[PDB]
Amino acid sequence: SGFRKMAFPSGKVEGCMVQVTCGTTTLNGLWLDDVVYCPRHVICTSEDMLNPNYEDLLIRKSNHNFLVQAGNVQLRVIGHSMQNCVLKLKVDTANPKTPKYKFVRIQPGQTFSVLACYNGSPSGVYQCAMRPNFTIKGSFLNGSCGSVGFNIDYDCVSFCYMHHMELPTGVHAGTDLEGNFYGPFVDRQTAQAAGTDTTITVNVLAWLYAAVINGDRWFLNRFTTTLNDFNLVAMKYNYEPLTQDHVDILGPLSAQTGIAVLDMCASLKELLQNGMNGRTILGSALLEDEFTPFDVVRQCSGVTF
């Protein structure tokens, strides 16, 4: 028993982290096969960021301008190209530690592990969710750009996020590994703000099921609700709409605990209208939304990688 915010083991990703230096800027790169992926803003100066023409800045660069360091070994860049907001640096050496991998774009509500890096060296791993406003509530300092978000499926790493910037409110924005930003963000020094965030409803329900599996039942009630009545209530409390897809995904947890999804929805509705009343659920006084239904099953059943 116990329920923790748990990240995937980061080993397969640690063996891919490298340091990328271009001019005065140093950030992280992801070395897979003979390619190093990193944010394209590494080519920018402070002035260039205000209004950058990345094609123009990149054409002026030569391969030797990019200093790639894997541990204490310098890699030689033999080519460079840009794919959306990611820079792809072709290197002469293929990473011998390249794991089985895929590039996947995730949807809001999905969780992933972040391997925070500085100077190509991993310093921490944490689990977070893609917020409905497309930001992530990460923990990043200067030099963290190029740090990646991932999930593991059996022995395959699915890279889903690359860190690019921090917004004024302290939240973070980035792209998938194809360089497409999550959210309406751009890699340019201009006024940008995260939209009003919402709670990931399906994840809160999954977490309430995790609490039931762990013996926390105080919030359960005899009531059920319709999906439409729940969505009318949930919308009032800035909660994401719960779809039939979400109800179906929660099915296995509903079968294991004996609590129907719409029955758990009525518990959630009462929690929203009345609060916790000085009580906690899984050591939290707030409803947690950064555990998906898959994360709960994985943790409460012990899937390994």
Ligand X SMILES: O=C(Cc1ccc(Cl)c(Cl)c1)Nc1cncc2cnccc12
Q: Which residues bind a copy of itself (CB under 8 A)?
A: 1-12, 14-15, 115-119, 121-128, 137-141, 143-144, 166, 170-172, 214-215, 280, 283-286, 298-305
Q: Which does 110 bind (CB under 5 to 8 A by kind): a copy of itself, ligand X, Cl ion, none?
A: Cl ion
Q: Which is nearer to ligand X, 2 or 258 (CB)?
A: 2
Q: Which does 286 bind (CB under 5 to 8 A by kind): ligand X, a copy of itself, Cl ion, none?
A: a copy of itself
Binding mask 91-130 for ligand X (x = CB under 6 A): ----------------------------------------
- Alpha helix locations (H) across 32-188? 46-50, 54-59
Catalytic-role residue among 145, 160, 172, 246: 145
Structure tokens at 220: 């359960």
Structure tokens at 99: 């794991």
Distance CA 263, CA 164 (A): 41
Chain length of the chain: 305
Distance CA 181, CA 178 (A): 9
- Cβ atoms within 10 Å of 51's Cβ, excluding its own: 9
Binding mask 138-157 for ligand X (x = CB under 6 A): --xxx-xx------------
Q: Does 88 bind ligand X (CB under 6 A)?
A: no
Structure tokens at 152: 């593991």
- # binding residues, ligand X (CB under 6 A): 15
Q: Which does 187 bind (CB under 5 to 8 A by kind): a copy of itself, ligand X, Cl ion, none?
A: ligand X
Q: Does 106 bind Cl ion (CB under 5 A)?
A: yes
Binding mask 52-91 for Cl ion (x = CB under 5 A): ----------------------------------------
Strand 35-39 with 66-70, pairing: unpaired
| 3-class secondary structure, 41 | helix
Enclosing H/E stretch for 124:
strand 121-129
Q: 41 an active-site residue?
A: yes
Q: 145 an active-site residue?
A: yes
CB 120 within 8 A of CB 76: no
